Amino acid sequence: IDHRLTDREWAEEWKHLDHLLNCIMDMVEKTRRSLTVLRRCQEADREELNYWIRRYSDAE
Amino acid sequence: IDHRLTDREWAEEWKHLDHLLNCIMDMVEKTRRSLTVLRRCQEADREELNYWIRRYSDAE
């Protein structure tokens, strides 16, 4: 355990932080887009609900 | 084109959203901790600088 890092080690640590943060953004961004599709799914459910309600009220 | 999920499929998507969000929590939290150690490296470099200033001025 020597806390005196070396220039090369320091740069590693920094660039590794960069990478961690980038992964996090990448995960969040993929997650975000994901919800674009999940919503289209929820919406498809509605269309179907509406469909049956309509189908039900059109045959008295 | 057909966005109607089954019950099984829905549960999977919710469950996976949760997992993604936890992976995010986990990276962030580990990163938080890591910085705690990184700081000790910064601070150690400073104790070393004091040593040298001192060393220099005590041979002045």
Binding site: E9, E12, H16 | S34, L38
Partner: peptide, 11 residues
Amino acid sequence: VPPGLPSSVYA
């Protein structure tokens, strides 16, 4: 080197 640095976080 010490244990818990930003590297070491795998990923």
